[PDB]
Amino acid sequence: TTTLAFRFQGGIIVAVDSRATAGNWVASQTVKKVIEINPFLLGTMAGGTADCQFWETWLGSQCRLHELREKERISVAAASKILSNLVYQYKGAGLSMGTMICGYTRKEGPTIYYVDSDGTRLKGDIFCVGSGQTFAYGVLDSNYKWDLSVEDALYLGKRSILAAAHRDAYSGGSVNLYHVTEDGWIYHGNHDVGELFWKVKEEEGSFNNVIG
Amino acid sequence: DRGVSTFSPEGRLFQVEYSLEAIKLGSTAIGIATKEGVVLGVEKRATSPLLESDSIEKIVEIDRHIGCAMSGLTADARSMIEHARTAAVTHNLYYDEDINVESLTQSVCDLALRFGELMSRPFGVALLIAGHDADDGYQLFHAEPSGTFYRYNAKAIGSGSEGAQAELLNEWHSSLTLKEAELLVLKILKQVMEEKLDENNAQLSCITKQDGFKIYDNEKTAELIKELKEKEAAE
Amino acid sequence: MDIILGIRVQDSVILASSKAVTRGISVLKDSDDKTRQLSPHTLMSFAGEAGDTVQFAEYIQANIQLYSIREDYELSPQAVSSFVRQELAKSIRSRRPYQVNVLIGGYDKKKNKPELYQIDYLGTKVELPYGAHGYSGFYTFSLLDHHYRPDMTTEEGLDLLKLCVQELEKRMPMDFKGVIVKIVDKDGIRQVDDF
Amino acid sequence: QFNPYGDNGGTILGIAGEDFAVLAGDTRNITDYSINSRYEPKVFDCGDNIVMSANGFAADGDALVKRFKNSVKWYHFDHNDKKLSINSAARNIQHLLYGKRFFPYYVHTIIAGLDEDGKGAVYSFDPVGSYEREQCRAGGAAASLIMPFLDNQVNFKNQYEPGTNGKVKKPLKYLSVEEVIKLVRDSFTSATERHIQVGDGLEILIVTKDGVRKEFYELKRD
Amino acid sequence: GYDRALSIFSPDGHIFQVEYALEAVKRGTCAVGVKGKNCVVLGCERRSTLKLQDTRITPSKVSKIDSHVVLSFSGLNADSRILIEKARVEAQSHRLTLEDPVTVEYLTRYVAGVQQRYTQSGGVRPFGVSTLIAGFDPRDDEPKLYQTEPSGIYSSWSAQTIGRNSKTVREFLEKNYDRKEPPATVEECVKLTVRSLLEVVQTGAKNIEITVVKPDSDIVALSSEEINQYVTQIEQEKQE
Amino acid sequence: TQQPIVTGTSVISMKYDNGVIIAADNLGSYGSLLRFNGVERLIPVGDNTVVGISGDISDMQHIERLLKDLVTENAYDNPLADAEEALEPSYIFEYLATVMYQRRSKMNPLWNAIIVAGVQSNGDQFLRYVNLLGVTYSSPTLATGFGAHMANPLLRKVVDRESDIPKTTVQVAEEAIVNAMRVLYYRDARSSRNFSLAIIDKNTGLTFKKNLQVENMKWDFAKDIKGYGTQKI
Amino acid sequence: NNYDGDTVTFSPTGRLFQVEYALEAIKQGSVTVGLRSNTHAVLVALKRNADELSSYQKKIIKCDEHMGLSLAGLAPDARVLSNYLRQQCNYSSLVFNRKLAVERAGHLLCDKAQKNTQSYGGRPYGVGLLIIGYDKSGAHLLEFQPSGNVTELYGTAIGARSQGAKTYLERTLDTFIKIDGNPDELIKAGVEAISQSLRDESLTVDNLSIAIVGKDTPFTIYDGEAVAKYI
Amino acid sequence: SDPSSINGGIVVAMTGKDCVAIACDLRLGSQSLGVSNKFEKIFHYGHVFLGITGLATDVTTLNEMFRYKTNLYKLKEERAIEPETFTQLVSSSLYERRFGPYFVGPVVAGINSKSGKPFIAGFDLIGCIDEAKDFIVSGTASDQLFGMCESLYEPNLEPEDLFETISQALLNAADRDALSGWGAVVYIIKKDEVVKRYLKMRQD
Amino acid sequence: GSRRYDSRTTIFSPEGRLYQVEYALESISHAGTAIGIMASDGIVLAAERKVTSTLLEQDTSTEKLYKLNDKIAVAVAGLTADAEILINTARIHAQNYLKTYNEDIPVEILVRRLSDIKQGYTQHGGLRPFGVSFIYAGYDDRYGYQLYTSNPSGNYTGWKAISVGANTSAAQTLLQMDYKDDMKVDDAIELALKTLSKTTDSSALTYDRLEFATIRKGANDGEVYQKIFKPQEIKDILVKTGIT
Numbered sequence A: 001t002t003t004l005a006f007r008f009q010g011g012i013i014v015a016v017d018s019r020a021t022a023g024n025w026v027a028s029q030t031v032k033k034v035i036e037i038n039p040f041l042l043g044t045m046a047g048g049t050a051d052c053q054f055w056e057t058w059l060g061s062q063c064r065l066h067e068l069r070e071k072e073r074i075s076v077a078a079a080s081k082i083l084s085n086l087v088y089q090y091k092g093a094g095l096s097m098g099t100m101i102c103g104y105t106r107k108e109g110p111t112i113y114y115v116d117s118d119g120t121r122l123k124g125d126i127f128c129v130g131s132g133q134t135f136a137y138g139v140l141d142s143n144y145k146w147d148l149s150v151e152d153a154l155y156l157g158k159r160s161i162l163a164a165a166h167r168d169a170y171s172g173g174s175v176n177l178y179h180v181t182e183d184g185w186i187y188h189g190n191h192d193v194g195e196l197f198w199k200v201k202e203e204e205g206s207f208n209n210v211i212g
Numbered sequence B: 001d002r003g004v005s006t007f008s009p010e011g012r013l014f015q016v017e018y019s020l021e022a023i024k025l026g027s028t029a030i031g032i033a034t035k036e037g038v039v040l041g042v043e044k045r046a047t048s049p050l051l052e053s054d055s056i057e058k059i060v061e062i063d064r065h066i067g068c069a070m071s072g073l074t075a076d077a078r079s080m081i082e083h084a085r086t087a088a089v090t091h092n093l094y095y096d097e098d099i100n101v102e103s104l105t106q107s108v109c110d111l112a113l114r115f116g117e118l119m120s121r122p123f124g125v126a127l128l129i130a131g132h133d134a135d136d137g138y139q140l141f142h143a144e145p146s147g148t149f150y151r152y153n154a155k156a157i158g159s160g161s162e163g164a165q166a167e168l169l170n171e172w173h174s175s176l177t178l179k180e181a182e183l184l185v186l187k188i189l190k191q192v193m194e195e196k197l198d199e200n201n202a203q204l205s206c207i208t209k210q211d212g213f214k215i216y217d218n219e220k221t222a223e224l225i226k227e228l229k230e231k232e233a234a235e
Numbered sequence C: 001m002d003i004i005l006g007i008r009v010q011d012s013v014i015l016a017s018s019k020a021v022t023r024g025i026s027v028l029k030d031s032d033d034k035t036r037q038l039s040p041h042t043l044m045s046f047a048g049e050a051g052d053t054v055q056f057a058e059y060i061q062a063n064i065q066l067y068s069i070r071e072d073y074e075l076s077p078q079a080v081s082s083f084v085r086q087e088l089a090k091s092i093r094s095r096r097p098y099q100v101n102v103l104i105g106g107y108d109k110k111k112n113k114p115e116l117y118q119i120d121y122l123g124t125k126v127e128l129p130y131g132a133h134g135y136s137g138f139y140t141f142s143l144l145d146h147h148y149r150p151d152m153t154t155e156e157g158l159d160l161l162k163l164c165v166q167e168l169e170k171r172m173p174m175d176f177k178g179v180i181v182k183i184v185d186k187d188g189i190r191q192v193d194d195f
Numbered sequence D: 001q002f003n004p005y006g007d008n009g010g011t012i013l014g015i016a017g018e019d020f021a022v023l024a025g026d027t028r029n030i031t032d033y034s035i036n037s038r039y040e041p042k043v044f045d046c047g048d049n050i051v052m053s054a055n056g057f058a059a060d061g062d063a064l065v066k067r068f069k070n071s072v073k074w075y076h077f078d079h080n081d082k083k084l085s086i087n088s089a090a091r092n093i094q095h096l097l098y099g100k101r102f103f104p105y106y107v108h109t110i111i112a113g114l115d116e117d118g119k120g121a122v123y124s125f126d127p128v129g130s131y132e133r134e135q136c137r138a139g140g141a142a143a144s145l146i147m148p149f150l151d152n153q154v155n156f157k158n159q160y161e162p163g164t165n166g167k168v169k170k171p172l173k174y175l176s177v178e179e180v181i182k183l184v185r186d187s188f189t190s191a192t193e194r195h196i197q198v199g200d201g202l203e204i205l206i207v208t209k210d211g212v213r214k215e216f217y218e219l220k221r222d
Numbered sequence E: 001g002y003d004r005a006l007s008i009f010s011p012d013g014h015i016f017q018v019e020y021a022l023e024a025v026k027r028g029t030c031a032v033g034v035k036g037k038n039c040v041v042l043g044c045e046r047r048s049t050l051k052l053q054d055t056r057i058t059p060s061k062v063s064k065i066d067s068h069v070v071l072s073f074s075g076l077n078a079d080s081r082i083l084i085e086k087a088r089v090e091a092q093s094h095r096l097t098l099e100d101p102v103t104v105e106y107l108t109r110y111v112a113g114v115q116q117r118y119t120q121s122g123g124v125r126p127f128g129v130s131t132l133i134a135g136f137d138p139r140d141d142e143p144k145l146y147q148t149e150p151s152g153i154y155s156s157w158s159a160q161t162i163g164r165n166s167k168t169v170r171e172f173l174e175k176n177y178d179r180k181e182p183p184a185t186v187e188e189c190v191k192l193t194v195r196s197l198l199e200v201v202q203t204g205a206k207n208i209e210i211t212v213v214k215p216d217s218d219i220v221a222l223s224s225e226e227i228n229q230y231v232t233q234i235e236q237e238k239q240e
Numbered sequence F: 001t002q003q004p005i006v007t008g009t010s011v012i013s014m015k016y017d018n019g020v021i022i023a024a025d026n027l028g029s030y031g032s033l034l035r036f037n038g039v040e041r042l043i044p045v046g047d048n049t050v051v052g053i054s055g056d057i058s059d060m061q062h063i064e065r066l067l068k069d070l071v072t073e074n075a076y077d078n079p080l081a082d083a084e085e086a087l088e089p090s091y092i093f094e095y096l097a098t099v100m101y102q103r104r105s106k107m108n109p110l111w112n113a114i115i116v117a118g119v120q121s122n123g124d125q126f127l128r129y130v131n132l133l134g135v136t137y138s139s140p141t142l143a144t145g146f147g148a149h150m151a152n153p154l155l156r157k158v159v160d161r162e163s164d165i166p167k168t169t170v171q172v173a174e175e176a177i178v179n180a181m182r183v184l185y186y187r188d189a190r191s192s193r194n195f196s197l198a199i200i201d202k203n204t205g206l207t208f209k210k211n212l213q214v215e216n217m218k219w220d221f222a223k224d225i226k227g228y229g230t231q232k233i
Numbered sequence G: 001n002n003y004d005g006d007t008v009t010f011s012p013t014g015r016l017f018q019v020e021y022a023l024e025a026i027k028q029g030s031v032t033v034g035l036r037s038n039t040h041a042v043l044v045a046l047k048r049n050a051d052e053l054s055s056y057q058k059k060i061i062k063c064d065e066h067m068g069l070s071l072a073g074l075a076p077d078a079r080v081l082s083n084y085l086r087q088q089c090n091y092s093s094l095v096f097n098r099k100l101a102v103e104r105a106g107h108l109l110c111d112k113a114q115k116n117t118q119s120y121g122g123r124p125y126g127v128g129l130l131i132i133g134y135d136k137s138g139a140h141l142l143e144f145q146p147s148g149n150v151t152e153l154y155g156t157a158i159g160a161r162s163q164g165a166k167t168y169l170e171r172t173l174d175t176f177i178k179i180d181g182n183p184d185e186l187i188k189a190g191v192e193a194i195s196q197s198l199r200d201e202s203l204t205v206d207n208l209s210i211a212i213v214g215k216d217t218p219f220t221i222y223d224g225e226a227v228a229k230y231i
Numbered sequence H: 001s002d003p004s005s006i007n008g009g010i011v012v013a014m015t016g017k018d019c020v021a022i023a024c025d026l027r028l029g030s031q032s033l034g035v036s037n038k039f040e041k042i043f044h045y046g047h048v049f050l051g052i053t054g055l056a057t058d059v060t061t062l063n064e065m066f067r068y069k070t071n072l073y074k075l076k077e078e079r080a081i082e083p084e085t086f087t088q089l090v091s092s093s094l095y096e097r098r099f100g101p102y103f104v105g106p107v108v109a110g111i112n113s114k115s116g117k118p119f120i121a122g123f124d125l126i127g128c129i130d131e132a133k134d135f136i137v138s139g140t141a142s143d144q145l146f147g148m149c150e151s152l153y154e155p156n157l158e159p160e161d162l163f164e165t166i167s168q169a170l171l172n173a174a175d176r177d178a179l180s181g182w183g184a185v186v187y188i189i190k191k192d193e194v195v196k197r198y199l200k201m202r203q204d
Numbered sequence I: 001g002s003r004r005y006d007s008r009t010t011i012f013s014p015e016g017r018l019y020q021v022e023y024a025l026e027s028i029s030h031a032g033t034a035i036g037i038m039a040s041d042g043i044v045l046a047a048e049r050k051v052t053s054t055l056l057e058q059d060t061s062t063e064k065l066y067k068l069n070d071k072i073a074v075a076v077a078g079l080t081a082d083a084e085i086l087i088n089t090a091r092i093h094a095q096n097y098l099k100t101y102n103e104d105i106p107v108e109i110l111v112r113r114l115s116d117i118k119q120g121y122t123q124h125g126g127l128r129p130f131g132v133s134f135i136y137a138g139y140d141d142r143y144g145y146q147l148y149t150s151n152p153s154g155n156y157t158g159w160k161a162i163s164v165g166a167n168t169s170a171a172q173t174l175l176q177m178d179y180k181d182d183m184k185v186d187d188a189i190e191l192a193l194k195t196l197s198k199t200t201d202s203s204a205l206t207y208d209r210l211e212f213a214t215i216r217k218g219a220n221d222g223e224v225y226q227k228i229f230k231p232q233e234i235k236d237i238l239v240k241t242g243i244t
């Protein structure tokens, strides 16, 4: 797995790979690793696939109940804390979860919370989780600026997953892109890594080590 | 004294029959179902001019496709609304779909007779539950503290109910537009209200398939009141 | 988390706490504030197992804030530390104990004295002129034993603290990404933004 | 020490067409090196034009199918005989599976049917309830033997158009029910040759707007 | 456990235990709330039947629920402590989970919910208390004032009074409070609040308490002398 | 979680044209000690069902009492207890299968393998298996423990698939069962010579045969076998 | 009088007034008819509306593929009892792979209703039920009273003016019992029976509710234009 | 790992002529790391003195517990608790945690106010009472203390002679233990005066 | 069933009063008078035992004045048995607080806790309320010397001088007349005994009919001492103030 999310001028970029493995066996290349909690909030899926699926859909139900009761959009801080408090109750039982809860509200602006199954809850600007996280961090750290355009930020997220997909054996398949704005998230397509690699190699001049 | 779950010699539950009397003392609420949507309207009935009337919340959202109006001891309705909202959301979690308006109503009505010596007494509030689903279209239900619910084409509850229902009997037909229904609720509310009807002491709302449940602005309702006045002066 | 230090000088308590947050292989954050303000003149820094640290700290914060509102009165540092110790002493024999070590730095407005308490996850409390948790003491205590005076100024305390951090940065294998330093005195709590 | 789990072998396969869906599975049931039964049905009609199979530990498999069939029954009671849509069935099964998150149903579940637009649908579950809609999914013992073949012959992976040499992919043209059944039969014939737990018989359930139809084929019994 | 249904309907559709709880509120000392343009003032009556009282330690009538919200009441004093405690716990619980202090409306809705619950739970009687809850939402400068009562209904008020002779002071407020132009300053708002209590109180000495709540957790209680200056200025204008 | 103490070995069974046959030996082993020699492991329920049980004997005796209680309970307020509303093999099996799976799911299993053999109301043959894990399966031939490895291969030569059932008479089926019991006596170290056999036929009903013995055994060839390789004397 | 304050009190003549008052609620309810032959069993129910804008209250509830009932009295109590029957039918199928006998279903309803008549705090059920079903001993019709008394019958009726339909069925007994293999004629006899209980009002398309179960017929309910054929 | 030797420390008590003495070191540590040189292990409730060695969190917890219990005792009984009675209370309190015990080694010392009789007692972590006439020892250097006390002790020592004996017993025992030392306190207890003396010792 | 015999102890009257609380207060009005007076340098507690006998062992007897901790004491008016139940609860609460915070419980926090317990019996449980009124005399380092009272309703208030039990109307008037803010303990001792002497239903006020206590900072330097007076000491202070 490789999942990332980063804050910038135009909001948040979320980018994930698509591969799921059972040992060396590639179970699926078409896994949806971004959960659509609601039209404004996104969550990423790393660790236990079921745990992330089940509890982040549940989170969507809790967010809906909040805004029905309070007549106001739930904050990213409050939404992330509902999830982190829940998994903390299950601490020790064996839940496996590493997720970024991403949202863009009036009072907060673009906000990302890393939530963990040991109970960790961290606010931050750039997060990267999975077996291929170290590869994606390299591309992110050396190219990240706050004043990136939406177009360039989307590409950076795509390129960082590609970097991981290439080197990490347990990452690949395809890249899913999302752009989170204040008015909600916008899906920016599914990108097959096989086709994307050759396209990027030619246009960018990168991956000279690989023969194409 | 006597049991809370006691039957009368006529075969009625004393406490349920008495709660129905409390609902008769409540402010008027009216619902009208059409093929373009369902309209819900209420009398706010502020006890003093210093009471900020927009804080009177007698029309409430249960889900995007289900709204609800209340009449009687309105404090009792809060836990009923909470349950309704939870039931609507829970069903979406379990089944990845909207819940049927009837099923939601049935879930609310299951709470009603859970009283004895569970809660200590029945609810002292009646509900008009309005909504839309793909199977049965636009629907309006009347949920009582007896646990019984009837579907209605149009229904009025509260202190001006029997006078309003007689008026709804004459006015409703199967080809009403949404605009016609809005004016009709306003007309009948104005008839049964003690004080003169305006945008501050009355409230409108509707549920459509496209836009879902919406409570009307005071500015929007004020225009419909002015439109009503002119069309009644037109003959 | 990793390094948390404390030093009580003439008129204030100074708490230094690392900024790193490492999840295994990667350093996820380098600006983490491992502290909570319990009351206007009481600060608690913390280190231990992930999740449990913040959960415990916020739980204590909520309880002290609740007391402050109920009585319209700020509890003494001694009283707060005794409350915290009991919670940890209760915790250690629980089904799943809080794995959290804390330092409580406060200024007692009644006695006009700074106070530093060190409490580990077992509920072991000690009042100290200077303290630490984990391996932090192993590197720093020899320096503090030598230079510490009870009549030090806040500026002298910060200088002695810099020497301690420098020794940590030299001999410790882990990169803890520097420290956030906060001062607790009669005027309350403030952060030294350049360290 | 008592081991509450076992492995009854078996292999299942779900494929979603344009206006149909198939769910196939071998009829052999085993423990270790012994055959329990040469014909033990594994794919079930659960009503509402939904077919299901929970492959792996047969006791947990039977329990789950039984509970889902029961859920369909109570869905009708509680919601005015409303038809349970395939997406709603899938979400319901997640909750059945996750309910035993800390003592799981040791099965790989697949359901098949039509979505609310009448298009073919297949959903695939892990033992603790993570799920996804898929076009093609093999499960069980010989899943690793079948899926690569399906990638190549259903999705035309690694196939390009002659003359272009890698520049143009082979276009993804829609397959008929007769074409899919051919690929299913060849998948199980090949799996039977190379996997010891696969054989005896192949039972296929086909789902269309007209209903559920069954087809049976003999497999090698060695 | 004791399960007896004490709050029940009567043939005429009334719950007498809830209505008798209102009679306890009628007996309680008068409380008044007035919101200006940038403040809310809570006034409270102190019955002078009790002198030799120690005013330092005696429970004050206005209570802080959080640093930005206050609660006053009329009715049973012992009952009010239970509601205040529950509200204070909920205020901290909200900060802990939502990472934001309660809105005045939310806190009111919670207290009103507790009051309602005690009207249809077995083995309990309703609270003999009506409350005035005032304050400012976090990062908001719009004044808030709400009222609750034993039945559990609640609503927002431009100005409101509860307790004994509240009918009289509500009469005063209804003719003296203009919605188009509320008391523009703290002075004007306090003056109107003291004036309203002087219709009912008796002596303007230690019988009137005033608490001013401003935005951003700025809450202060006026002293005897400060209030006494308002009392003096009001009657000197009245002698005309 | 436990361990079996006193145990019963193979239960074997098969379908034939008009019904089913089931058999099991009369031994209750205590490890390698052949402790109890008069244990009945086929338990009839009414006149249409026979439940064969292997594994832990204390748990068998518990299951035996559950079935006895099931008959009592079925007769309560049931005028048709000996007619239309009598216990079917399919009812008895489903009940046991429920119990077995529930018990494994509480991590406290009934340490058994069970075969329910019988004939239904409509004359259909019933033969299904359930064990300590709650695993169930049906087949023209069924066997537990060692029987699964040695009896099934022999019984499958008579009825290899469903279409062979109408072609198999009760004489041929019983012959095959009796031969399998002999083979098991040769080769299973925890078996005995004495066994019971039950036939449930749709026409002639339930025939329960006790005190049967393995006969026509071949041992004479043993006299010629000497040493383990090179020895001649 | 002094002995009707709760269900736990016998009168001096040995009567249970709270149970009798619960029985009274059934008499206020709308009429419903039950009858059977040797192949089929039929329920016919007159539904009641609140007014002309309202829907007609449903009277028939399905319990299983082979069983269901009609109600007269407190509808929420019928929902509780029918839900219990659904569970008991379901328990029998899941645990024993066995369809629950109609007679045994009656025994279970009797015992559930009885517990509410002997304990303090509770109240009797305020509804009467007519259960039809087809099991291993053919067609069946049961009448449930909230006193606990359950009775197997060829035909019956409960609710307001039910005496007219009950007399008709008592005359027609020898005719309708012989209507085997003809569902339409058995329903006709039921529609003609319930007509003996009508006054002022007649059977319309949204007024009538019919259910049937039989040899090769799952329990199915007919409403709306599906019953126009029988009007 | 072993809870009774994480923090370290020792307590010793002796009897003399019309007097008792109880003494302790001042060290608290985290295994090898010295943490505090002011961690006193002797407490008193009225005229009854209690020393506690072992896991420090339990030492603190038990002191707070026995303060709690002796305060309620005094309010109800209208008199201060006696050493013999308190000994039974410690025993009772420890045994109630039989299968989840406090990891401690308590030592009671005092003079009965009515009889004037000197009294000392010791306990294991689970409540068994050791009521010795001569001396009681506890802590990580209990072996060393047994050796010192057995040779140095003689009965009926005067208060100022008993001080020297118990002080030398503690000091030399602590200097042969890595987890004891860093200062020491000695209490000399007579029927109506108690003297507390801090000893000068090596700080390694 | 059982409902028939239920008195319903926790209901409002039509006037909005709690029947049982009102009747418990009526009970307390027949109890021996207890007085508390707060001075600048201490607090006085004085209380009258109810019609005693010559054979009553006075020196070991306690029916009025009780110790909650070293800093807080109470005077009782009402059912003695009910008071002891609450007193033991209060003693435990004080110790719980001391264990938790390592500081003595502030007087008001203890008073609020007991008062909340009394309140609970008026709102839920269906039990009769405690027929007890307390005068709390205490000291802490926040407010210094404090006097409180609580009654069966669970309502509590602070006082400079206060009486409970019998003839409170007459007693409170006499206290209101002679009390001044700059008063000292020795003056307050005299006022308390003079007030009881005038309000008593007995023919004369003697040592055997009294319980007496003082909370003074008349303890050597910055600390507080409680003094429960002995029979002989009450006899001496009666002679000193000139009542006998």
Ligand SMILES: [Mg+2]
Pocket (backbone or CB within 6 Å): D191, D192, D193, D194, D195, D196, D197, D198, D199, D222
């Ligand atoms: Mg094979």
